[PDB]
Paper text:
ERGIC-53 transports certain subsets of newly synthesized secretory proteins and membrane proteins from the endoplasmic reticulum to the Golgi apparatus. MCFD2 is a small protein composed of an EF-hand domain with two Ca2+ binding sites, and functions as a binding partner of ERGIC-53 in a Ca2+-dependent manner. From the amino acid sequence, ERGIC-53 is predicted to be a single-pass transmembrane protein that consists of a luminal carbohydrate recognition domain (CRD), a long stalk domain, a transmembrane (TM) helix and a short cytoplasmic tail (CT). Here we present cryo-EM structures of full-length ERGIC-53 in complex with its functional partner MCFD2.
As observed in forms A and B, component Ihead shows a swing movement of the CRDs, in which the CRD dimer between upper and lower protomers shows a side-to-side rotation as a rigid body dimer. The rotation direction of the dimer is nearly parallel to interface-H (side-to-side rotation).
Residue numbers in the entry:
A (entry chain E), C (entry chain A): 42 to 367
B (entry chain F), D (entry chain B): 42 to 312, 324 to 365
E (entry chain C), F (entry chain H), G (entry chain G), H (entry chain D): 40 to 102, 108 to 144
Write the structure that this text describes.
Amino acid sequence: PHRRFEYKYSFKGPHLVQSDGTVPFWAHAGNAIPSSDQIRVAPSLKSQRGSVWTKTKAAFENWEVEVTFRVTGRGRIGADGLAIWYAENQGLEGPVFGSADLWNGVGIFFDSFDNDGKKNNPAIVIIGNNGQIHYDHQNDGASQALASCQRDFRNKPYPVRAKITYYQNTLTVMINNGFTPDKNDYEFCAKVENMIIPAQGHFGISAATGGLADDHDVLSFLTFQLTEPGKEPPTPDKEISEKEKEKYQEEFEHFQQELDKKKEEFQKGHPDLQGQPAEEIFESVGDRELRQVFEGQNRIHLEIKQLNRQLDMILDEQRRYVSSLT
Amino acid sequence: PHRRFEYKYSFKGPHLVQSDGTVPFWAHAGNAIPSSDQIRVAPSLKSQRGSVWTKTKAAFENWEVEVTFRVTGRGRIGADGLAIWYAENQGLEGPVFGSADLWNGVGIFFDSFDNDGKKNNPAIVIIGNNGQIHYDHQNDGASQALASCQRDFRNKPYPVRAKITYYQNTLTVMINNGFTPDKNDYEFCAKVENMIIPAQGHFGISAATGGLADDHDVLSFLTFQLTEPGKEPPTPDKEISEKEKEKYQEEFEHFQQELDKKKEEFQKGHPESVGDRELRQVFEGQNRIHLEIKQLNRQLDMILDEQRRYVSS
Amino acid sequence: PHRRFEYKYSFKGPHLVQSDGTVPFWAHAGNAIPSSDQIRVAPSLKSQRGSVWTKTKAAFENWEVEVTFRVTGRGRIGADGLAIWYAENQGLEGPVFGSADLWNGVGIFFDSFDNDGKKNNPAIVIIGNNGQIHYDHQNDGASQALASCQRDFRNKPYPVRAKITYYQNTLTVMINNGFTPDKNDYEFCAKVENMIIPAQGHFGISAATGGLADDHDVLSFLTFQLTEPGKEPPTPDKEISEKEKEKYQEEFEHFQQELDKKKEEFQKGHPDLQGQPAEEIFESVGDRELRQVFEGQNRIHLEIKQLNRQLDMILDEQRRYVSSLT
Amino acid sequence: PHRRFEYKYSFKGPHLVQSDGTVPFWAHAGNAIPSSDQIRVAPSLKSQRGSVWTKTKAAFENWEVEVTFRVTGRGRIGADGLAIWYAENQGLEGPVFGSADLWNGVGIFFDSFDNDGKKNNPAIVIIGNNGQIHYDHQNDGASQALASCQRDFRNKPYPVRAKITYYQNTLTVMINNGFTPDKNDYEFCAKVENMIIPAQGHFGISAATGGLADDHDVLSFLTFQLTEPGKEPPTPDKEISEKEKEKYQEEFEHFQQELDKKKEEFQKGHPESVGDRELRQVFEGQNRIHLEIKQLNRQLDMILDEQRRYVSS
Amino acid sequence: GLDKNTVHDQEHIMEHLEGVINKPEAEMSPQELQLHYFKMHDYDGNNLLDGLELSTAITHVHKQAPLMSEDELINIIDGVLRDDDKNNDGYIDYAEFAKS
Amino acid sequence: GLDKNTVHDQEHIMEHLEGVINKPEAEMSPQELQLHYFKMHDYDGNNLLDGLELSTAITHVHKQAPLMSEDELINIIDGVLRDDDKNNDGYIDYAEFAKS
Amino acid sequence: GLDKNTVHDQEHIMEHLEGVINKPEAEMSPQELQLHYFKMHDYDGNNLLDGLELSTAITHVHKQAPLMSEDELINIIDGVLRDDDKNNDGYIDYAEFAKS
Amino acid sequence: GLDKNTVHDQEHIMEHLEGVINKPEAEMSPQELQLHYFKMHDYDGNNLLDGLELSTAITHVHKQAPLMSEDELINIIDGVLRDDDKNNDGYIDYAEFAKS
Ligand SMILES: [Ca+2]
Ligand SMILES: [Ca+2]
Ligand SMILES: [Ca+2]
Ligand SMILES: [Ca+2]
Ligand SMILES: [Ca+2]
Ligand SMILES: [Ca+2]
Ligand SMILES: [Ca+2]
Ligand SMILES: [Ca+2]
Ligand SMILES: [Ca+2]
Ligand SMILES: [Ca+2]
Ligand SMILES: [Ca+2]
Ligand SMILES: [Ca+2]
Ligand SMILES: [Ca+2]
Ligand SMILES: [Ca+2]
Ligand SMILES: [Ca+2]
Ligand SMILES: [Ca+2]
Ligand SMILES: [Zn+2]
Ligand SMILES: [Zn+2]
Ligand SMILES: [Zn+2]
Ligand SMILES: [Zn+2]
């Protein structure tokens, strides 16, 4: 299909927030902390609820949503987790992942805590609702789960990417689990066929924290309107010619290469610039525990060195006392 | 010395914040997020600055503060870091660890990022200030450092504890590095002798975040007024008789035992993990080894002084 | 639907093997070790290949297969893994999970090693083949994967159960991941719709081991023929009456309760019988590593105790020498 | 003493088995699975019994065997366990740790299951036998135990090593418990003095599995003939001159350095993990602490004997 | 092939019940004897005999004799299932077992 | 401000004890429920109340109302410390709390 | 609203290029100036301006002034997309940018 | 049985060196390839050949043929140990291996 980038239902860095501290075209409520690079929907404190919703309603029958997020915890268990909504009304606050219950629309829940006790979470659950059906928070929505997909999306070296595509009444969720820096590495996660969602609704993202604590950051949110493959008006009259296209793209490329050459000699011209590595900002929880255990052994080494020095001193003192006697 | 707990200059959980969203007897400014069990002075976002200061000023000449904190990072490098201030006025905003520059008082800095490049970070740096000097941010205040120390306080399994004592015009900083859950396990870090500070000032904490990002949580802050044993004034004829105290305390203990029995019976009447317990056992064993080696060091010192006294004969 | 237990295409303990050491109605080849309780298709040595296949061909259009297995390793990575086949010919030996390539039938692969490098394994991959298509061993069959399902089935406290149902040209794979002793706890794993398989073929199980090493045990294998819900001849003439049924089931129950009462007083009559726990035969790999680390600290404690005893002895000797001088 | 490696009574990897599926100079019987890098004497199935014995008999009076093995179990309880035999004839089948009862010789048993109920398992039990006695299987041979030891050899991170030395009619068993990858790290376990064994016998290993199940892998088995330094006969006038030996060895070392350079250049020319490395570092640190404390014990013994000699004056 | 004399044999089930239940009393009733035969050969628990349990119940390893061939065993079990099983579930219940 | 009637409240300690204790008593002695009040508000677990614990005990919302000003809380807690505490440790013990 | 004088401003892009490239030479060509304007405002890398990058390129935080309202910003960006974008992809390419 | 021609073979060591070494030389000295042969067959990594390593070096399949009997291998290895080894350690060193 053909995809058009709808800016009014999207947000990205590195200028996510304006001077007023608010996300343009988006309304945030709860404990959400919008920053200049990401939105921390729910920080790593106890009982945090956050939501960011579109101010205006969307009217696309076939759409695509790309969400880049991180869920980072100090332990091996998350707290409540994330949710991506396409509702008809703004939930704001409530018990369902920091948003209100009894919604009219679709909701993709990234659950990181196993409430039911089957040890199947973290998992992605696609749940539709008409307005009167509640959500079982203590059962992870297993009875209402239209499509579940067991994917671990916590504490990954690279941001987890999710692509939710509603096309021809099919909702396809494809997830890049965040092991590689490559953006276009989407693997299949789940699919719901022949699902009816409201014709117009609000996009939204929400997160919640429970007894444990995770940082739920959303780095980007991209909304694309998808048109039909054949029902696209060409309208070639607005196009001028291929001659102007040929007169423009090559001078664009010449400008790019000339700018690269003109920047290279001054990148090394001022050597005061410093860089940072990439692997050093990732460590697994078990690896961190083992490194802490290894770090705890230095005190024993230092105390044994002190003991050895003192014992050598007393040995030399005893030898000098024997020499003094003789 | 004798310690009196001052509630007006202290905060702790598990009810740290009230319904108003403000810490009682404290004022927070910046990106600080006062929660119900800790204060996140600066979260793990880029360019975060937070401060929490006392609303009123202190009125004691010898004091002591116990600060429990965590600095948790996604990586092995840290942000700008923490600072504990005894100043003359509330800065509440500024570029020196989230607080104002050109202060008048003492500041204990917990630096996590090595701006100087001497590979001496994270570290504890005591910096005094008479009122007119600029903190060397790009050199970790090495020139202005009255004293210094070098402990790693990031990503520890247990909260890191610090005890800062101003007694007889001497400032002592002792740090429990956070490998044990014991509250009184402090180890000596730094000491400044003959330092003059203002007789009345504000107690504060602050934290700042730079290119990298750490979460700077403060779990507790307890301020004790210290008085000398010689200067301690006795106030008799106010307490009740010791027999009445014993009569009260025996039934206090009996009733608390009865309370424990009731708690157990209605916890069992009305209806940790593997690996975490194993890690706790590993750390407890390491602490036991450390304690046994410390005892061996004490015994070796004992036999050393005994041999010295025998030689002196 | 209605399910009939086909014994001739099934094996099950606790008398799995006969006196000849062979599985009845099954033929085993490779490094498979049939025991009286399970079949170790591939042991925990390097480069082991094993297969057990049905001797006779099955002729059910709609069937159900229940497989109970364990895959146990000393590390956190498996080696090659398991495979359940419904082919038309017996593969025996080959590079595809211990069985021959270019098969004509369906094959459900339980892969425990990530050959491609996407860190998506272990996973269950449903792969169909017509006879000429090869299998990409170094890419985990990702291109040919009709349905993948990311499930971790290694080192579980209870045996992993898999139910593969071919009904109305739909292959549904539902897996009990083996966290609970309950047998009927099958959660959804994968589904392939409208798949054509050969009309008659051999059932089989196979396993392989590579650079690393896992024990691949199969405790049971049950094959059920499924009939159509409505196309079932009742034939009530063979049924005698409900009166004989009522005269039989209650005396069966009376015999059961009388046997229980007659066994209870002699279960305690001879107290020489001994039992064993259940949790003690399960420990996670990380938990085992931490327990080994804790176990390694006892030597340090014993040596410190020896040091303390010797230092106390030398202190008492020094005191007695001072007393001797005086 | 002087050790001569006897190849006829030894096996090791990484080419343990040949194409015939038989261990060279050894005969295996039972459920033993001779692989190319180890011998699984008894796998983790129920009621497994395996034995691997020497085809020929030994002809030395003083000997020494180094056995490297792993006993890996799914649970914290074990099977019947391992046994290392120096017998008079190949039993190859039986109910005593997978080998025949009523043997004539010595047997070192590595018991993993406590049949007696004294909570003294897993353990190492040296049992001699003149030819006519039944091994008390349900009491771990406690009555017949010439000596005993108590080490845990199951589920260790590294292979467990055992050295059994018959020298001057004394049998010594020393065990590296498997916390370090060092080959020569043995610690004393047991010793029997003045024990008589047949002058010629078969060297064997065996393992048995009961209600529970452990994998009993044998990675290596090396048998050394020991001769006394006084009894060592010199055989001169056969070796080449020492100058020729040095001339050979200098270019041997030069050519092996050149080989290393070639290996590196065509390993880089033609194209472990985190956590595992961390665990290896943890175990190395524990071994370093143990070695340092052993050195402190040696120094304390030195100062103890020095003080004793000073007192004796 | 599941003969009437085979199920009506005291010595066989007396050998089976040794150890598990230490109550050899006297001659047992034929219905009690048949109930013991049905219960002892269901190695799982479902109160439901099947082909595998019947195969174990036919080819014993009792204390020599040649093992029965696969074809004869298959024919015997198929005949038993054809004659006794009536609901075509693949299992033999006690109501189905009591007919023969 | 820590009045005698406020400490001697059966229903308040009953409301605190819900969930942790499932033993609703009919009627308790004033000293019994006073000991319950003292044990309930020692959050740190040291049997030693201080100013912060008293501030939590006085200004908790329960089940709307304007919160008390900080100056009034300071005055109340300072008065309690001045009247009850005798060892000048800054902590309120039950020996010091037995007066009121 | 992306005026001709706005893109043809030397001081603006001179302020932007400070620090990243230390080459203030002289007055630049209008085509070079426009190319620098297009390249500096694409904060990602795709050689493709969109609505969000344009919103950042309009409401600067340069060194006071009231922030532009949401409705006026929406109207400005919608007008720019309606006039300049021709392939209806939602992005503005350099070929699409060179028209205005 | 460890003949001079068997050790001095240019292609056997080349076939062994494939995979680990990617340097096919044109022609090498007999002592050079003999040193390569000695370094290749020391699997344990101690520069000390023994009977087991020689047995691996003599009876490995390469690329069908009947395997040598154990008695012949025993005789060959015993002869090699008797002729070359001089320190009676049971190991064959290159100092002892330099004779052949
Ligand atoms: Ca949940
Ligand atoms: Ca769940
Ligand atoms: Ca710094
Ligand atoms: Ca520094
Ligand atoms: Ca694979
Ligand atoms: Ca893969
Ligand atoms: Ca035993
Ligand atoms: Ca025992
Ligand atoms: Ca059954
Ligand atoms: Ca039936
Ligand atoms: Ca308290
Ligand atoms: Ca007090
Ligand atoms: Ca762009
Ligand atoms: Ca465009
Ligand atoms: Ca060697
Ligand atoms: Ca030699
Ligand atoms: Zn029988
Ligand atoms: Zn209350
Ligand atoms: Zn600008
Ligand atoms: Zn070769």
